[PDB]
Coordinates of C-alpha atoms and ligand atoms in Angstrom, one line a residue:
X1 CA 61.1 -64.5 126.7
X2 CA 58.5 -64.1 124.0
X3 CA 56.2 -67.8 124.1
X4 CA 58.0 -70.8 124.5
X5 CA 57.7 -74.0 124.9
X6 CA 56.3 -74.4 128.4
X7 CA 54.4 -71.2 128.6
X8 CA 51.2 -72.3 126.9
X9 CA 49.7 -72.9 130.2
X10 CA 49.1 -69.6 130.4
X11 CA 47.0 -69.0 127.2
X12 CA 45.5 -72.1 128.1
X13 CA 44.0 -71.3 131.3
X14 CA 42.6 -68.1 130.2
X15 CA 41.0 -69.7 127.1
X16 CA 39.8 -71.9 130.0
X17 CA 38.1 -69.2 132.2
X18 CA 36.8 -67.6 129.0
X19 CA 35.1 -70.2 128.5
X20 CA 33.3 -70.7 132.1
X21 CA 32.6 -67.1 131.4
X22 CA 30.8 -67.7 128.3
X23 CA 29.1 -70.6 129.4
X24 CA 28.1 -69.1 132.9
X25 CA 25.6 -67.3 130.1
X26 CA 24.8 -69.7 128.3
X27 CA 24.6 -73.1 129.9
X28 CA 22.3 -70.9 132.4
X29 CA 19.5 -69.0 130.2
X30 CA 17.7 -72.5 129.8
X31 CA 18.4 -73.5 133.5
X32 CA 16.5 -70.2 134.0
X33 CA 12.8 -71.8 134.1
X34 CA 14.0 -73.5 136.9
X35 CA 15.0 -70.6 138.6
X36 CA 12.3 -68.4 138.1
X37 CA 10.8 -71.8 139.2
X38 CA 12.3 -71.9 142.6
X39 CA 11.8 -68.1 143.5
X40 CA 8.0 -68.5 142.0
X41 CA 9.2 -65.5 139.8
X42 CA 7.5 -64.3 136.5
X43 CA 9.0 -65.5 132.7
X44 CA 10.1 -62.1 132.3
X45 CA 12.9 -62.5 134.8
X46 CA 14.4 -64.8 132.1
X47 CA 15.9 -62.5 129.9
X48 CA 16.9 -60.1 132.4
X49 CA 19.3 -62.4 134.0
X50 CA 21.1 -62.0 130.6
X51 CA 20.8 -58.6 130.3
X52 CA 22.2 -58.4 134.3
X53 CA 25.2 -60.1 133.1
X54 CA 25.7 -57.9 130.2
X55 CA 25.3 -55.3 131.9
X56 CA 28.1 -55.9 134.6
X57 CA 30.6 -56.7 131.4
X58 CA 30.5 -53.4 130.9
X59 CA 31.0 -51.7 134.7
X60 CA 35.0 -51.7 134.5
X61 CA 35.3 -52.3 131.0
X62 CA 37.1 -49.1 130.3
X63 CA 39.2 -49.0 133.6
X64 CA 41.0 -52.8 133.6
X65 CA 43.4 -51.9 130.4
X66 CA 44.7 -48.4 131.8
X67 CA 44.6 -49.9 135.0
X68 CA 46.4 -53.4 134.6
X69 CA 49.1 -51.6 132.6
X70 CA 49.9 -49.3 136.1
X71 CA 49.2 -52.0 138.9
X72 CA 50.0 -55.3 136.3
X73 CA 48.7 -57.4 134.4
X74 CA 48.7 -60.6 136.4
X75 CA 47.0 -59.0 140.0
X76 CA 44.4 -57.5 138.3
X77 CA 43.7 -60.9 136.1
X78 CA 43.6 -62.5 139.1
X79 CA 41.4 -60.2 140.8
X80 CA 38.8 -60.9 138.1
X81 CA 39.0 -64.9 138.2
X82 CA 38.5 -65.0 141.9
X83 CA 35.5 -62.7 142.2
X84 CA 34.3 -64.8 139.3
X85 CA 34.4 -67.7 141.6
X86 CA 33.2 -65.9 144.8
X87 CA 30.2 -64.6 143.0
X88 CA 29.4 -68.0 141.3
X89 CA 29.4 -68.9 144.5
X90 CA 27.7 -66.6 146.3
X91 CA 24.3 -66.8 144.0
X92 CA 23.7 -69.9 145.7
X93 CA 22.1 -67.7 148.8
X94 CA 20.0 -64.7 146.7
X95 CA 16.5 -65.6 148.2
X96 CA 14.8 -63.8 145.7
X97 CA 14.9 -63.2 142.3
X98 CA 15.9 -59.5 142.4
X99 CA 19.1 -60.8 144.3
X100 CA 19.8 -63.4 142.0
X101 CA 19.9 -60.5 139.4
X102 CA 22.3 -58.3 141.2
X103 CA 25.0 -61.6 141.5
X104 CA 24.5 -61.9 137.7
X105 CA 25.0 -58.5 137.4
X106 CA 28.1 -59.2 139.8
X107 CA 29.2 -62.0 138.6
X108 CA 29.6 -60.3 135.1
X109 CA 31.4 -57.9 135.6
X110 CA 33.8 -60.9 135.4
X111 CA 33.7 -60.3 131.8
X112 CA 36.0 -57.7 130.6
X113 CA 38.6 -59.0 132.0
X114 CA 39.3 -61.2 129.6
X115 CA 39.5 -58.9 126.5
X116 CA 41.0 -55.7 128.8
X117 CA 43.9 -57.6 130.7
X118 CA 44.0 -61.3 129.9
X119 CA 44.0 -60.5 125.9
X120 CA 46.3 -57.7 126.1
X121 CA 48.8 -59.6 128.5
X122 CA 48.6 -62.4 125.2
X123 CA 49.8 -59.9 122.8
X124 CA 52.6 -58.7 124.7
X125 CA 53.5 -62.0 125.6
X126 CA 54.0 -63.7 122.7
X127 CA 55.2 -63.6 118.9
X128 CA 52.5 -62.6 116.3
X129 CA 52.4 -66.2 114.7
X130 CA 51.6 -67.8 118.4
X131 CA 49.5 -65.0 119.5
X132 CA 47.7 -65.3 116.0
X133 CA 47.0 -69.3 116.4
X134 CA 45.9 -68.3 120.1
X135 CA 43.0 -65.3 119.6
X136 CA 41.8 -68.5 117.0
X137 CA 41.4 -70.4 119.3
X138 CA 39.8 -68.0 121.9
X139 CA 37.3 -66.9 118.8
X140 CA 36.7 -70.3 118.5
X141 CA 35.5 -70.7 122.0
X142 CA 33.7 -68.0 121.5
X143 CA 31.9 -69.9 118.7
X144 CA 31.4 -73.0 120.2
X145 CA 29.7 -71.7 123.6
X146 CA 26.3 -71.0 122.2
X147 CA 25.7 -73.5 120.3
X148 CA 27.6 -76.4 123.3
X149 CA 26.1 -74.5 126.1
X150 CA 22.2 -74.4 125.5
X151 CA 22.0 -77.9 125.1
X152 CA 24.1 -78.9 128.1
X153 CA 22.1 -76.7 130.1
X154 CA 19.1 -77.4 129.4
X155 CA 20.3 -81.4 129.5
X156 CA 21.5 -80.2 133.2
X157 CA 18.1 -79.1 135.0
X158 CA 16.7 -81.8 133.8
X159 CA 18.9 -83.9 135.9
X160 CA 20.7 -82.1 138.6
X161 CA 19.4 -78.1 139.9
X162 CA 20.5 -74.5 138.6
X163 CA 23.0 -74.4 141.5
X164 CA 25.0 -77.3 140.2
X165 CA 25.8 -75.1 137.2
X166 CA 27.5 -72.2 139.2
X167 CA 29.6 -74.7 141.3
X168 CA 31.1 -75.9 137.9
X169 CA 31.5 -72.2 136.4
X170 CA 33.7 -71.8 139.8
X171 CA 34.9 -75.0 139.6
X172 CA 36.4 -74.6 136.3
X173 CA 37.4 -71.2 136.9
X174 CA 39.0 -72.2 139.8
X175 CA 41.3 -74.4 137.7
X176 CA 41.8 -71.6 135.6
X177 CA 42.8 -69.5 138.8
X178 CA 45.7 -71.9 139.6
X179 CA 47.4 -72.6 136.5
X180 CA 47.5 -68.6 135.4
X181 CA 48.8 -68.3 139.5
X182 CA 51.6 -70.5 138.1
X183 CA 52.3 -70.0 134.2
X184 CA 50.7 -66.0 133.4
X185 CA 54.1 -63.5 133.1
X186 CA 54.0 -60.2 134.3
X187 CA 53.8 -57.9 131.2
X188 CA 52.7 -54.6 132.3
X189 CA 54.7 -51.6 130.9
X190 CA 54.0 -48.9 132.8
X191 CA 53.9 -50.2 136.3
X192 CA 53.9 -47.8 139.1
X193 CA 52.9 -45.2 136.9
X194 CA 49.9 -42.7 138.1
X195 CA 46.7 -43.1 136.4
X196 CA 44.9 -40.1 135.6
X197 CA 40.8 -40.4 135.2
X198 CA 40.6 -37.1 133.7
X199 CA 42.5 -38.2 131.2
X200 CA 41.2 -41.4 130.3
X201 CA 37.6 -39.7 130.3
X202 CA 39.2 -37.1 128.1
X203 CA 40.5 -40.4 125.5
X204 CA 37.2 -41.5 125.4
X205 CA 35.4 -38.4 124.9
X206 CA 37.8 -38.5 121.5
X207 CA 37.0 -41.6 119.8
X208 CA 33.6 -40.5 120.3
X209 CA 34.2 -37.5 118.4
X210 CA 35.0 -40.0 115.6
X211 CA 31.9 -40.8 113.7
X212 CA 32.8 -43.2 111.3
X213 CA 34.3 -45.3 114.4
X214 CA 30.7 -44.9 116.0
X215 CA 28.8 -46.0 113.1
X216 CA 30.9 -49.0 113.0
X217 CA 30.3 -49.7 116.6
X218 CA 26.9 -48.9 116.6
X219 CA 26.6 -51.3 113.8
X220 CA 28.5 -54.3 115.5
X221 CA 25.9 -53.9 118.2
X222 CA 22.6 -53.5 116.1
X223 CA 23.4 -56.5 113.6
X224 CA 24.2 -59.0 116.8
X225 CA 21.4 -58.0 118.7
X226 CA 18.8 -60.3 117.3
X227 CA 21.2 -63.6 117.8
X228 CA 21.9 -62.3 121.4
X229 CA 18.3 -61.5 122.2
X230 CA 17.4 -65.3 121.1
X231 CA 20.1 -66.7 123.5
X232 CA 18.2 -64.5 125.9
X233 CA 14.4 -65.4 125.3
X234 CA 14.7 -68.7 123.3
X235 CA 13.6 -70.7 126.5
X236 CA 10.3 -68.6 127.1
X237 CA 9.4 -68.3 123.5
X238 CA 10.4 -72.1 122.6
X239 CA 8.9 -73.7 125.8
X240 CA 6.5 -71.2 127.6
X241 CA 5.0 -69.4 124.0
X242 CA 5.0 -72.9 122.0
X243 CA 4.9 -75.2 124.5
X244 CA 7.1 -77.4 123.1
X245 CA 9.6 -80.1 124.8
X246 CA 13.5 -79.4 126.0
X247 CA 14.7 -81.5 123.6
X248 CA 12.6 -79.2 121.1
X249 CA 14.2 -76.2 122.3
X250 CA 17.7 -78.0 122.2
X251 CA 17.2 -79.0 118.5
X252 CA 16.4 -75.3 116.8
X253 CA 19.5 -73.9 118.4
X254 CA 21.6 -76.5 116.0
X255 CA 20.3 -74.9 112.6
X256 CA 21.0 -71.3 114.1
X257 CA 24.6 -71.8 115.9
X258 CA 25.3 -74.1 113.2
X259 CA 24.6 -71.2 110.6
X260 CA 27.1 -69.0 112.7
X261 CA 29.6 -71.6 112.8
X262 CA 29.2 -72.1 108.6
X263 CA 29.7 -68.5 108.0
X264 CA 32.5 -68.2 110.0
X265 CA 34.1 -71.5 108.1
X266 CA 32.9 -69.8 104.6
X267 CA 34.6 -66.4 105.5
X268 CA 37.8 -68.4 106.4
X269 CA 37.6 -69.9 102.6
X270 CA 37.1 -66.3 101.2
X271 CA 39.4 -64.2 103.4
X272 CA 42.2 -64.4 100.9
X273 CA 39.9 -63.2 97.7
X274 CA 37.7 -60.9 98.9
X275 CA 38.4 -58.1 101.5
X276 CA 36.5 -56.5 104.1
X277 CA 34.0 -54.5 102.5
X278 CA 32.7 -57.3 100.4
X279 CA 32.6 -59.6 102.7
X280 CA 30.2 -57.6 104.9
X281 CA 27.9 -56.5 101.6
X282 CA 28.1 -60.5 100.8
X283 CA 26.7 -61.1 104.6
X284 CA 24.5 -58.4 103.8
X285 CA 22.3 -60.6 101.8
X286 CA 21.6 -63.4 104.1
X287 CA 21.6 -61.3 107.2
X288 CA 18.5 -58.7 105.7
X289 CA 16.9 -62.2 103.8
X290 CA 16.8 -64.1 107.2
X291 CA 15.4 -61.1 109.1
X292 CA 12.7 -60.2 106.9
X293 CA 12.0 -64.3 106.5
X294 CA 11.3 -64.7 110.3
X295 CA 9.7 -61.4 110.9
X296 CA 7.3 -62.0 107.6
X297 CA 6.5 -65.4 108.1
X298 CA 5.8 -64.7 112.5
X299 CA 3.2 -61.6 111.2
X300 CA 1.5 -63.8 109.0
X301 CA 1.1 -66.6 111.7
X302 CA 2.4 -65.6 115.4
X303 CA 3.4 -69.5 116.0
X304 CA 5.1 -70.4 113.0
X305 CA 8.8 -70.9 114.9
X306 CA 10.0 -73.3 112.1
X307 CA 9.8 -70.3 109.8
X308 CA 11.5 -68.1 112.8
X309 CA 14.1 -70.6 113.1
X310 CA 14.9 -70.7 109.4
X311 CA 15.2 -67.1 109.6
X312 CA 17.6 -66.6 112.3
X313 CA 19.6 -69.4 110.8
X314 CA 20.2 -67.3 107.6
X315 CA 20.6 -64.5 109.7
X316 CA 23.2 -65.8 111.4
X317 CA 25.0 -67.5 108.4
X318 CA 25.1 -63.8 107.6
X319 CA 26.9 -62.7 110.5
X320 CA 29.5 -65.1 110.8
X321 CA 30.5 -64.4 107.1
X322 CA 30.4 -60.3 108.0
X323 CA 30.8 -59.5 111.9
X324 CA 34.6 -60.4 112.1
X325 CA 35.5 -57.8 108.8
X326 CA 33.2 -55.0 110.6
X327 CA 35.1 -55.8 114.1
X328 CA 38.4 -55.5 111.8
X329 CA 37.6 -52.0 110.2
X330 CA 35.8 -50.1 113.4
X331 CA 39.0 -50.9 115.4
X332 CA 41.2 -49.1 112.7
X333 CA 38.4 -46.3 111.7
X334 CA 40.4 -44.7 114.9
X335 CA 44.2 -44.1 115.5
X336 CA 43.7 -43.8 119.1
X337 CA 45.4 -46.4 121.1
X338 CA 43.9 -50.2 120.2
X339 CA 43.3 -50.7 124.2
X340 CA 40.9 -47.7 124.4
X341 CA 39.4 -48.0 120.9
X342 CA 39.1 -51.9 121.9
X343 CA 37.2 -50.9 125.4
X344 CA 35.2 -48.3 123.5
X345 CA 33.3 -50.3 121.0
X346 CA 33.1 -53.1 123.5
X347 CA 31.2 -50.7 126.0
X348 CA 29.1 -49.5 123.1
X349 CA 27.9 -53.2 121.9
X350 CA 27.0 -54.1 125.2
X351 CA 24.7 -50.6 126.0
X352 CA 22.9 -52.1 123.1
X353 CA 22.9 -55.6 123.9
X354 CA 21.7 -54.8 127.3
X355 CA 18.7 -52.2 126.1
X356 CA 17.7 -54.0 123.3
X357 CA 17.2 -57.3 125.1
X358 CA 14.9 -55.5 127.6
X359 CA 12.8 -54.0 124.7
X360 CA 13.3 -57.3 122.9
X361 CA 11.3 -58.7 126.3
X362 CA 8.5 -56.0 126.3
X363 CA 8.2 -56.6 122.6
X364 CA 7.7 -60.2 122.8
X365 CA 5.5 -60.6 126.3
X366 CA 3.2 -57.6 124.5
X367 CA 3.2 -58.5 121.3
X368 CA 4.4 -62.6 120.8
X369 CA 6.8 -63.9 118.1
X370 CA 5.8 -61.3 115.3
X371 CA 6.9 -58.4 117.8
X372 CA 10.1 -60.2 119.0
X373 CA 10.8 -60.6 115.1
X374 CA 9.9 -57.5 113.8
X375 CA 12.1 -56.0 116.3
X376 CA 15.2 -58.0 115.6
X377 CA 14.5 -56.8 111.7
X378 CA 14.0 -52.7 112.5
X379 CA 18.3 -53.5 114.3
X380 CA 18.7 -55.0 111.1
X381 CA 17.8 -52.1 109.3
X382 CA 20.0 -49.7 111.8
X383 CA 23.0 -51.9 110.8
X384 CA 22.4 -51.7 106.9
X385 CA 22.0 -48.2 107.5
X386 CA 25.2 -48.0 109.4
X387 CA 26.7 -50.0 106.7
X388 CA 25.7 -47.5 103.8
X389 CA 27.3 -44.4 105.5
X390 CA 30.5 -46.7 106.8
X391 CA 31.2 -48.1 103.4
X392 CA 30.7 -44.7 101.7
Ligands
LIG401 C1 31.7 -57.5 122.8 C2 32.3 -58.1 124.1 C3 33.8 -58.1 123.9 C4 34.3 -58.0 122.5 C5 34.9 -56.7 122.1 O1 35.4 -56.0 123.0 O2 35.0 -56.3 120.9 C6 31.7 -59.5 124.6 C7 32.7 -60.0 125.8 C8 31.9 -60.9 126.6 C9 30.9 -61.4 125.6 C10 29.6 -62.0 126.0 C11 29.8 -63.3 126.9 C12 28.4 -63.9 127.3 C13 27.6 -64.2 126.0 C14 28.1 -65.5 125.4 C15 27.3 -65.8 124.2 O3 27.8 -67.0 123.6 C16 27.3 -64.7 123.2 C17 26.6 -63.5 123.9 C18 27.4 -63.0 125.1 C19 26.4 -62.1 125.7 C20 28.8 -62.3 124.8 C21 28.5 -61.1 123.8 C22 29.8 -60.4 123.5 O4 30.6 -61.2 122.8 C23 30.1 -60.0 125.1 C24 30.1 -58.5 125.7
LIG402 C1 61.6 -37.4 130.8 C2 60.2 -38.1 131.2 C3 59.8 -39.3 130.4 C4 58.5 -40.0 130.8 C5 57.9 -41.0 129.8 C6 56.8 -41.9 130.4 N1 55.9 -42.8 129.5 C7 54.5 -42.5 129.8 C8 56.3 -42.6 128.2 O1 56.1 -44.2 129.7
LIG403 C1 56.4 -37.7 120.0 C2 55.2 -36.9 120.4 C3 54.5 -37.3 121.6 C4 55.1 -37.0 123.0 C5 54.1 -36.7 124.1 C6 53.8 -37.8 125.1 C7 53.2 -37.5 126.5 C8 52.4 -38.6 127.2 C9 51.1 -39.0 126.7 C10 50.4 -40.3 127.3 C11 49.3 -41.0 126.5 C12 47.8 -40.7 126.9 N1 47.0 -39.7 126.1 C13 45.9 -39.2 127.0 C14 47.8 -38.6 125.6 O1 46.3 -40.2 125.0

């Protein structure tokens, strides 16, 4: 039974849990100055606990697909929402902030669940117009969460404590948890099957093989790494570097997210006169402009932030007109099966992601604003790099 009329519950609930995922990032990078508060921990805990949660996205990212297929679809989804929830939980008792870590780490590995099983399940479960209108809406959380979940959380600690904020990540995955109990359809093919690791290892050692895949991976990671290592320091270098207000740190993630959210609405007005390779040269130009604007601007004078800000925010207009075509292309630069291309370039963002937020950190704490930028331009570079090879 392909969709129908009462099986949107399922879709639903997993756009739900998605969504406590994304959040349980970023309603919690501002909440953590009250952490590293509580635990009398240094500011360079802060982005870790970002990086910690990238990090575990990435731990079974290349087993849940091959594996979900044998054992099913809906135990293994499962699986994932509950330790979501037990984790959530349990990071209410890490006593320091080196436990705290590990449960973000943990809790994390929460992630790939989503895109491995859940996502997969969707495709086989539905007709491409409904599964079409669905990943919309799933990209569209994926939109919102950033730019909603900064400015909730830092609203929260200024109310209630960090805790609060991993009850409701539970909470709301634990919603989540009953309604796919009751609406998610088994759609696993090759149940019972025997999974060989040799083999899978050997899968992935092939779409490595494929350089033009790589550079397009390698890319996707590079060109988001500046917006991602913002989410991650934003609260140290907004209101422990400038010493500015909440409500301050609040108001510059509006031009930025906003900027995403534009280019994203721009490249939906294009789509149908452009193509891909235009559309990531035409992001081109506001994603190497914004860089070099914050990076320029922060070398000149190390607390100019309105300058950063305006930078990132034409950076990221840049990225929501490009990032979706360069997704599109990598996937189909290999003929490999989707599910381990998919896992692939996933696994290779976040080694990035979770690297470069950690250098992002040294670069900042050493070397203030005009490091933090100059760093976010040199992945700038690596992606227009990419981008010349890949388009040629
Ligand atoms: C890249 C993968 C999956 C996409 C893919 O496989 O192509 C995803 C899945 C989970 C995603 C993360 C969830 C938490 C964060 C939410 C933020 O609002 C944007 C940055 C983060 C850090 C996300 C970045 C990236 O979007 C991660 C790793
Ligand atoms: C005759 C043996 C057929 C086995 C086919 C199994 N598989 C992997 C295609 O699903
Ligand atoms: C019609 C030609 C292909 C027939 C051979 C199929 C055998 C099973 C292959 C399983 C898929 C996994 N792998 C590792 C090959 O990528």
């Amino acid at each position: 039974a392909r969709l129908g009329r009462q099986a949107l519950l399922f879709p639903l609930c997993l756009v739900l849990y998605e969504f406590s995922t994304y959040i349980g990032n970023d309603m919690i990078q501002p909440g953590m100055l009250a952490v590293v508060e509580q635990y009398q921990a240094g500011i360079d805990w802060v982005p870790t606990s970002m990086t910690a949660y990238l990090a575990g996205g990435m731990f079974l990212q290349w087993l849940l697909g091959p594996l979900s297929d044998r054992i099913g679809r809906r135990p293994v989804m499962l699986a994932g929402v509950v330790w979501f929830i037990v984790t959530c939980l349990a990071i209410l008792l890490a006593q320091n902030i080196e436990q705290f870590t590990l449960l973000r780490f943990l809790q994390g590995i929460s992630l790939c669940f989503i895109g491995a099983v859940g996502y997969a399940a969707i495709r086989e479960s539905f007709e491409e117009a409904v599964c079409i209108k669905i990943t919309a809406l799933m990209a569209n959380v994926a939109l919102i969460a950033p730019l909603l979940g900064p400015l909730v959380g830092a609203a929260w600690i200024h109310v209630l404590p960090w805790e609060g904020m991993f009850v409701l990540f539970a909470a709301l995955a634990a919603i989540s948890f009953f309604g796919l109990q009751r609406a998610m359809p088994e759609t696993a093919t090759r149940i019972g099957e025997k999974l060989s690791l040799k083999e899978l290892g050997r899968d992935y050692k092939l779409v490595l093989k494929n350089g033009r895949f790589v550079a397009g991976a390698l890319a996707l990671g590079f060109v988001s790494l500046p917006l991602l290592a913002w989410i991650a320091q934003s609260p140290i270098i907004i209101i422990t570097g400038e010493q500015l207000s909440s409500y301050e740190y609040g108001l510059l993630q509006v031009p930025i997210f906003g900027a995403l959210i534009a280019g994203n609405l721009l490249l939906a007005r294009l789509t149908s006169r452009r193509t891909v390779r235009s559309l990531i040269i035409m992001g081109g130009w506001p994603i190497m402009i914004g860089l070099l604007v914050a990076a320029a601007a922060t070398v000149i004078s190390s607390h100019a932030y309105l300058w950063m800000t305006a930078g990132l925010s034409i950076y990221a207009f840049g990225i929501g007109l490009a990032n979706a075509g360069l997704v599109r292309l990598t996937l189909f630069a290999s003929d490999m099966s989707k599910g381990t291309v998919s896992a692939a370039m996933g696994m290779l963002q976040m080694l990035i992601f979770t690297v470069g937020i950690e250098i992002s950190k040294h670069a900042w704490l050493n070397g203030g604003n005009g490091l933090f930028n100059l760093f976010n331009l040199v992945n700038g570079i690596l992606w227009l790099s990419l981008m010349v090879i890949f388009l040629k």
